[PDB]
Each structure stands twice: as C-alpha cells, then as structure tokens.
C-alpha cells in the first residue's frame, strides 16, 4: 500500500538498479518474462510496493531509468532481467555528460530533467499513496551526480510531504577512477544536504575489503560488488513488504534516526557474510549477528567509527528469532561500548523484527547507522577540493556551461559548516 518509486541515474545507478531488480524479483518470485512463479502466498500480498499490475497479471517494476548517454541502458535491457522493465521508462539523450557536474545540471540535464518529471508524475499519481522516492547514483560521475541532484531538487519542490531515499556511492580514499571527483562530489553533496531525508553512503574500497577478507573471494567483480549493497538496500524496506512482530517503514527509520534535519548521512552494513568454506564453523544465532553487525570489517563505508560517536542506530532484524535476546544484544552493546555512544540520548539502537528470512538463509539483519565519524568522509573531499581550487585545476570545464566561482565558494561554505556541526555534536 505504501508504494515506492525507484529512480536511477547514470552508469553506476543503472548497474546497481539492475542488480537490485535481479535480487528483489528473485525474492518475490518474478520470472524474467514478468510472471509470478513462487511457492508461498505471502510474496504476492505486498508486491505493489515495488511493482505494478498489467493486463493478464504481468508485474512491471515502478522504476524510472535515466541517463544522458544510452551506453548503459541498452546493456541492461538485454541482460537477465531486462525485459520486465517498462520500455517507455527508459529516457535518454544523444550526448552524455562525461564526468562533469556542470552539463548534467545546467545544459544537458536541464533539458532532460522535465522528461523524468513527466515519467515520475505519471507513475506517482497512478498509485494509491506514495511513501518514498528511491535514488541510486554516484557522486563521482557527471550524469548521476549532477542530474540526480537536479532531479531531487525538482521533485522535492513538488512533493514536500514524501520521503527521499538516496544511495550515493561516495568515492573511496585510496582509489580515484575519476580525477575531477572533488568538484562533482562537492557540488552533488551540496544539493543533497538540503533536499534528501536519508543518504546511504557506499564506498567501493569497503566492498573490496568485504570480498577480500570477509567473503574469501578470489575474483571480486562488479556484480559481486553490486549484490553486496543490493542485499542491504533491499533489506532496509523489508517491514513494508512482509508481516512482522515490529514493523518499521521509511518514516519510522527516519523519525527514529535523525535528531536534526542536517544530520542525515548514514552508514550501512549487512551481517551474515562468511565464506562457503567457513560456514558451519560458527552457529547462526543472535549474538553472532549482533557481533558481526558492529564489527569494523562489515560496513560499506570507508570510515571507522572508533574516532567518532553514534547518535542513533537502526537495525532491522529479519527472520524467526526471539525478542528479549535482541534486547539483551542491543543493550549490552551500549553498556560495554558506552564510550562510543552519545550520552544525552538514552538509548540509540532502534530495533525492528520481520518474520520472513531471505531466500536461502535462516536469519539476517541490516545496519543503518548515523555516526559523527562520517565527517571524515567530507574532510578528505574538502581537502582535495581546496587543493584543486588554488591552481584552478579543471575549473574552465565548469565555467563554460553557465557557472561562476561563488557557487564553488558556497559549496565549500556548506561543507565546512556541516563538518563543524558534526564536530560540535561529537563532544
């Protein structure tokens, strides 16, 4: 009933959304031709949250696909789960951005932004009641980092009631696969901080660390990287789609998660990751899942929570467990690690229990974390922005599309203030 609308922009968002519509169609029992083929009747009950109807019982996703260059959409249309998408939901242009925030926000996303508004209004007003907008993109790109922010600005101007859900792939510290990322990422995170309700930061180095030691994988490809965050991003919205002893929708994971509207950058994780050669050497119980929750090796962001604090924390349990074991696990973790939690909020862990485990497990969970140690992600970006600004490194590629230097200066003025407020609540 509480429908969502999925948006994905750019190459990274397109691949991530493709993997998401693999896993969540496998979960609900959707054949790649668009027909339900499962076992239980509990999967068809709440299928409208991510899907629509059609003529003859077909299930098409409520996903809107957009990029400036069609080099990625035609690859994901001919893939495994490519024929269930609406053929009109693909909207694109001739000439792509090419790792520039300026064109995809001012001169090339500015004439394609009305297209996604057209499609999102058509998909939005046909549903009963909406409870969120899901966006997956990247901050280092040009058609995801620039056009995604313009899309959120144009959508939040129309529906201030609803909730914005963003999955931004923040760049990793030791890795740079786009040189001009300190400009695009800064200009993207300036626009995100005033329009989105909850931002999930994903670092690719943390994903490589997961497949390095946590999963014992020799050939970690980009599909293996996409599936790891797709499991979490499908585990956030579990309680809407399945019955539970303690439900939590997008608004519950927003009211109980942000104490201030400018502090909404999160830091996700996912417990039950072990090698297939190290599975039965440890029992599957609540203490193991809650230990490997808070461990430093099992979150998708490259920031370490030891030098920070934890304002509030959510964790959606999923499967068949008890309740007071969860309460012991999420009270003792605050009791011993009290030096790494804020003291002016009495409890910080918000818990939710669903009763349907994923396909192939016994019990799983999902981490949602607001930490003041996420300010280390923006210290590096501010340092790299200041390093590329005194010499005006790639600046002439940005003025040529209707920009100016005071926009860069006010983006920096937003970033140092956000970092300063996180540091003031760190103590």
């Amino acid at each position: 009933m509480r429908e969502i609308v999925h948006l994905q922009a750019g190459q990274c968002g397109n691949q991530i959304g493709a993997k998401f519509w693999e896993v969540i169609s496998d979960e609900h029992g959707i054949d790649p031709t668009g027909t339900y083929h499962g076992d239980s009747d509990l999967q068809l009950e709440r299928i409208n949250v991510y899907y629509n109807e059609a003529t003859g019982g077909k299930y098409v996703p409520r996903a809107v696909l957009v990029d400036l260059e069609p080099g990625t959409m035609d690859s994901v249309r001919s893939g495994p789960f490519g024929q269930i998408f609406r053929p009109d939901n693909f909207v694109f242009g001739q000439s792509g951005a090419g790792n520039n925030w300026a064109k995809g926000h001012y001169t090339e996303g500015a004439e394609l932004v009305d297209s996604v508004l057209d499609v999102v209004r058509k998909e939005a007003e046909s549903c009963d009641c909406l409870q969120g907008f899901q966006l997956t993109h990247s901050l280092g790109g040009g058609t995801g980092s620039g056009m995604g922010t313009l899309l959120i600005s144009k959508i939040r101007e129309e529906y201030p009631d609803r909730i914005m859900n963003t999955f931004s792939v923040v760049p990793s510290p030791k890795v740079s696969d786009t040189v001009v990322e300190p400009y695009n990422a800064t200009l993207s995170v300036h626009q995100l901080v005033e329009n989105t309700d909850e931002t999930y930061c994903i670092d690719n180095e943390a994903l490589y660390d997961i497949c390095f030691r946590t999963l014992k994988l020799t050939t970690p490809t980009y599909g293996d990287l996409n599936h790891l965050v797709s499991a979490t991003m499908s585990g956030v919205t579990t309680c809407l789609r399945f019955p539970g002893q303690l439900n939590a929708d997008l608004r519950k994971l927003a009211v109980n998660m942000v104490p201030f509207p400018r502090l909404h950058f999160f830091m996700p994780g996912f417990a039950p990751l072990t090698s297939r050669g190290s599975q039965q050497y440890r029992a599957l119980t609540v203490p193991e899942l809650t230990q490997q929750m808070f461990d430093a090796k099992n979150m998708m962001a490259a920031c370490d929570p030891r030098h920070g604090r934890y304002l509030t924390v959510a964790a959606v349990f999923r499967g068949r467990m008890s309740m007071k074991e969860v309460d012991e696990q999420m009270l003792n973790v605050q009791n011993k690690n009290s030096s790494y939690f804020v003291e002016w909020i009495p409890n910080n862990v918000k818990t939710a229990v669903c009763d349907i485990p994923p396909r192939g497990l016994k019990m799983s969970a999902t981490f949602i974390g607001n930490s003041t140690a996420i300010q280390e992600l923006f210290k590096r970006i501010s340092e790299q922005f200041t390093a590329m600004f005194r010499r005006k490194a790639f600046l002439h590629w940005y003025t040529g599309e209707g920009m100016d230097e005071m926009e860069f200066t006010e983006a920096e003025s937003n970033m140092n203030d956000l970092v300063s407020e996180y540091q003031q609540y760190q103590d």
Partner: protein, 58 residues
Amino acid sequence: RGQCLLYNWEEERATNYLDQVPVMQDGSESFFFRHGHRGLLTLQPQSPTSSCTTQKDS
C-alpha cells in the same frame, strides 16, 4: 482475484467461489455475469420458502 491487498480485497477473496470465470478466450466478469451476479441479496439462494402463516401456527 484477490492476491495483492490494494482496494476491496477482503470481499472477493471471500467471494471467489461465487464469481469464478470457468475458462474461455477473453473471459472477464462482464460477458460472464452480464445477466446478473450470484448471491447478491441472499447467500443461501435455494432454501425453500416458509410455509408458516400466522393462523397456521397460532
């Protein structure tokens, strides 16, 4: 009929056994049940009428 819980889902999941289209090409509940639905006013449509009058019981 009622597998996804959207709008009026209690009623026809309780009324599939009365409005089951058998099988045909097309086959909606428009050319079937054009001449009337089943059990609109009384769920027991074949109970015999009461032969009890006022004077034949008093």
